[PDB]
């Protein structure tokens, strides 16, 4: 019996995105009006606009929060070919201050902070088919150093860090490929950090994702011996990735992978545009051209099913 309560946003232009902070006490919204707004949740469960500023002169494609250990930090990326880092400089005098602009050749299609145990790192991807990884050398001085350039050889549309804090797994990034490519398949690529070469190397290519990829999400690993990846294309796909075996005598490779499609769902009825896991990785949300958000969950027999569908008027489908 989910209940939705409308608020009068009164946005100058429609906001193309909303992002919660890590604690779900704050949200950021962004719009065609060239602004970002920040909203704080009162004790009475009401939202109040606490900051509003003009951010750019280009289509803000993505917004992301840093981990709260680095303070109140936002990153945004744009059609203007830049990513920007913002810090909430409060006195009640909040005024999200631009700390840097990353300027290294085409639209920056996605931006994601790395898992906190890797430090204050930011990945960007661009339609030039490059992923760039920056590091802030001082968390108190939000200067950024370009650490890595990863040539994907396909237009990058989206990126996901593997959130696994296990020291048994090298840092991993999934990347997509929007290119319609009548033929080229492999539109999801996986990169692994190689300690011996101090470089990201291509570990995997999901050859079954011959369709254009719109979004990708690694599931929270929560002690599994295998990774789970959701992929948004013309359908919703779920992959399990099992790392292969090993010998302590010597090792310098990407440790090849066994990949299985465990689910494929065409029930979207339109090019599924977004996929998002809940905080436990037990429920998937998807959105598509059918004007619905769908909720997916496995039962105790690992059988995934839909568990909810919505309407244009805002009512949940009976």
């Amino acid at each position: 019996m989910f209940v939705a309560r409308s608020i009068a946003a009164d946005h100058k232009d429609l906001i193309h995105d909303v992002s919660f902070d890590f604690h779900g006490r704050r949200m950021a919204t962004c719009s065609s009006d060239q602004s970002v707004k920040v909203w704080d949740k009162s004790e009475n469960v009401n939202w109040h606009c606490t900051a509003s500023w003009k951010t750019h002169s280009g289509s803000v494609w993505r917004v992301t929060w840093a981990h709260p250990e680095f303070g109140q930090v936002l990153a945004s990326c744009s059609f203007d070919r830049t990513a920007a880092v913002w810090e909430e400089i409060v006195g009640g005098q909040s005024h999200w201050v631009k700390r840097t602009t990353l300027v290294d050749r085409t639209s920056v299609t996605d931006v994601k902070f790395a898992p906190k145990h890797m430090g204050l790192m930011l990945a960007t991807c661009s339609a030039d088919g490059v992923v760039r990884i920056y590091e802030a050398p001082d968390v108190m001085n939000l200067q950024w150093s370009l650490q890595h350039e990863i040539s994907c050889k396909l237009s990058c549309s989206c990126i996901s860090w593997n959130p696994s804090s296990s020291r048994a797994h090298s840092p991993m990034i999934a990347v997509g490929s929007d290119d319609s490519s009548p033929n080229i398949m492999g539109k999801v690529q996986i990169y692994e950090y190689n300690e011996n070469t101090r470089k990201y190397a291509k570990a995997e290519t999901l050859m079954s994702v011959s369709d254009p990829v719109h979004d990708i999400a690694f599931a929270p690993n929560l002690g599994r011996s295998f990774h789970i990846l959701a992929v948004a294309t013309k359908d919703v796909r779920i992959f399990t990735m099992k790392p292969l075996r090993k010998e302590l005598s010597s090792s310098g490779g990407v440790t090849k992978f066994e990949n299985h499609t465990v689910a494929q769902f065409d029930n979207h009825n339109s090019q599924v545009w977004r996929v998002s896991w809940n905080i436990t990785g037990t429920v998937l949300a998807s959105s598509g051209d059918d004007g619905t958000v769908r909720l997916w969950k496995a039962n105790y027999m690992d059988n995934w099913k839909c568990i909810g569908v919505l309407k244009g008027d805002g009512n949940p489908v009976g």
Partner: protein
């Protein structure tokens, strides 16, 4: 709306939903405003105050059970489990009663309150059916006594009818009088039926002779007793002989002048047509089942119950009425299909409470196949993990979910770590509670996260003492150095330390970082200076400068202090100080920028150095004289 794409964002237990736009650019005629806030929440009835009370009381019950699961064997243990089951059902009762008073006093929530009373009725109904069966598992004989008690505890309409009849000035002339007599017979309540018949025996002489025969038949009716030495075969023979006595009285036309006494005698024979004519007194097919068992099959075996249950449902529902979801649950229980009982209740119930606690209790009865599901955990751990995860969504109940996760080490420790790091720490009291919970369960990284978060919150609030205390608890040497440097900004500026008493009491915590070490040792030097231990203060300063624990600007500061110290009215010690001065100067020539190199104190430093050289020379001569 106007073919708009849905954006979503997962919160810690909430789903944020919004209209993104169109991925089309400014387009689409259909015009309006996207002022819609959509928080989709999983779960709903948990918010009830009474249900929360139930949950607290039963967490107490669960903890008790777990702790006592090591102490008792066979029969004693079985009885203890039965009593735990009864306690759960009593909590259900209290909750229903409270909800009912609430509905009575409040008209607007009474619709919903009655819906929830019916929900709890569902819960107690299923819990108790399952209990009785698996946990008691009574053999042929006691089974029917318990089923008569079961119908009596859940079907109260006959007692209301009889109370209304008894409130009338003339109970025997009341329209429902014979319905009260027949209802007591249908429930096996022969003594209460006889008390009503004794009133009718007063009305007429012809009624009195028939009432005496019927009273004697009801009095002689064989009943099973929980403790008799009587065998089921000796009971069956007495029951057959009593039934032949009833049949003989009917065949002799003994009751032909009173249709109601004849109908009661036909009920005593188990006449199915007359039992079905009295459906409105039984109200349910399962009351009809138990009345059929009483008058046709009093020695029924557990293994035969399903056949009679199905036959009773089919006969009772023999019109346009479809079985209710409760009927499927009760039939599955009479079939002894525990998995089907759990499945049907999982479909009908909004809440996992019934299926979680009934399955937990039935697992303690050693019934389910004893193996893990599909992830190194069993039906019990899976359902407890999902229920506990549900409690973590709620701002006050997440603390209860912690203890449920402790139940299974494999299936609740990693979830507990993940959730403990996500708790909104708004107050020091809440953080201290979370820390106590983690420390008991050995979770270091989670506690480090807690402490660092608290200390950064303190850096934002400008509470330097609280921030330092939290950084020390974090062992956080990096954050320790950060706060030491903030105090250094403050002292480079004011000429005095804030919070003197804390720095003076650092003790062994001073060793957490070299920067903190320097800070504390320098504060000790100032303390020596206030105590006129001038030599001691100066030597401490010199040692700090030579160890280079001091940051390369405190070199100037400490060097000027050495300046007046030297200025006052062994040779090796004098040479040492000279070496320290020269090292400082070489460092300056290299590290210090040309801009900072050009400052005022140079000439003052040179005069201090000349005074030191003169004192050392004379001091060395004095030392040589002492050696002589």
């Amino acid at each position: 709306q106007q073919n708009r794409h849905i954006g979503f964002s997962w919160g810690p237990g909430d789903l944020l939903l919004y209209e993104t736009l169109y991925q089309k650019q400014g387009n689409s005629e259909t015009a309006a405003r996207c002022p819609f806030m959509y928080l989709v929440r999983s779960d709903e009835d948990i918010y009830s105050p009474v249900l929360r009370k139930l949950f607290n009381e039963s967490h107490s019950i669960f903890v008790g059970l777990q702790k006592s699961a090591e102490e008792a064997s066979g029969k004693s243990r079985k009885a203890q489990l039965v009593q735990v089951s009864r306690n759960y059902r009593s909590v259900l009762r209290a909750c229903m009663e409270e909800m009912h008073t609430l509905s009575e006093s409040t008209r607007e929530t009474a619709q919903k309150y009655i819906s929830q009373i019916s929900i709890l009725s569902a819960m107690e109904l299923s819990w108790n059916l399952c209990e009785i069966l698996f946990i008691e598992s009574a053999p042929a004989g006691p089974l029917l006594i318990l089923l008569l008690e079961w119908v009596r505890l859940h079907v109260c309409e006959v007692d209301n009818i009889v109370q209304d009849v008894l409130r009338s000035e003339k109970p025997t002339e009341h329209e429902k009088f014979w319905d009260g007599v027949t209802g007591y017979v249908l429930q096996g309540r022969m003594n209460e039926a006889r008390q009503l018949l004794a009133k009718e025996a007063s009305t007429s002489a012809s009624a009195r002779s028939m009432c005496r025969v019927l009273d004697d038949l009801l009095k002689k009716m064989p009943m099973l007793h929980t403790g008799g030495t009587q065998t089921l075969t000796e009971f069956e023979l007495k029951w057959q002989h009593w039934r032949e006595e009833c049949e003989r009285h009917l065949q002799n036309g003994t009751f032909s002048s009173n249709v109601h006494m004849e109908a009661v005698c036909r009920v005593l024979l188990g006449d199915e047509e007359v039992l079905l004519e009295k459906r409105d007194l039984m109200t349910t097919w399962y009351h009809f089942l138990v009345s059929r068992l009483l008058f046709k099959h009093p020695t029924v075996k557990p293994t035969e119950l399903h056949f009679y249950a199905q036959s009773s449902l089919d006969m009772f529902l023999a019109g346009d009425s479809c079985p209710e979801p409760l009927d499927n649950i009760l039939l599955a229980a009479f079939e002894f299909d525990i998995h089907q009982v759990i499945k049907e209740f999982s479909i009908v119930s909004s809440n996992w409470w019934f299926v979680a606690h009934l399955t937990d209790l039935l697992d303690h009865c050693q019934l389910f196949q004893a193996h893990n599901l599909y992830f190194g955990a069993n039906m019990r751990e899976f359902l407890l993990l999902d229920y506990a995860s549900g409690l973590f969504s709620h701002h006050s109940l997440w603390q209860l979910g912690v203890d449920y996760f402790d139940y299974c080490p494999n299936l609740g420790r990693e979830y507990l770590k993940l959730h403990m790091e996500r708790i909104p720490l708004s107050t020091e009291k809440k953080a201290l509670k979370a820390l106590r919970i983690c420390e008991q369960r050995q979770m270091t990284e989670q506690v480090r996260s807690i402490c660092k978060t608290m200390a950064m919150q303190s850096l934002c609030n400008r509470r330097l003492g609280s921030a330092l205390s939290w950084s020390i608890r974090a062992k956080d040497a990096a954050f320790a150095t950060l706060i030491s440097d903030r105090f250094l900004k403050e002292y480079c500026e004011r000429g005095n330390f804030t919070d003197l008493d804390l720095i003076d009491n650092l003790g062994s915590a001073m060793l957490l970082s070299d920067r903190l070490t320097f800070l504390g040792k320098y504060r000790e030097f100032h303390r020596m200076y206030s105590q006129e231990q001038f030599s001691e203060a100066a030597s401490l300063l010199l040692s700090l400068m030579t160890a280079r624990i001091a940051p390369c600007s405190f070199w100037l500061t400490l060097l000027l202090d050495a300046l007046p110290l030297l200025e006052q009215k062994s040779a090796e010690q004098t040479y040492e100080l000279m070496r320290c001065l020269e090292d400082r100067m070489a460092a300056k020539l290299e590290s210090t920028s040309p801009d900072e190199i050009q400052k005022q104190d140079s000439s003052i430093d040179n005069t201090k150095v000349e005074m030191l050289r003169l004192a050392l020379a004379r001091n060395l001569a004095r030392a040589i004289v002492t050696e002589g």
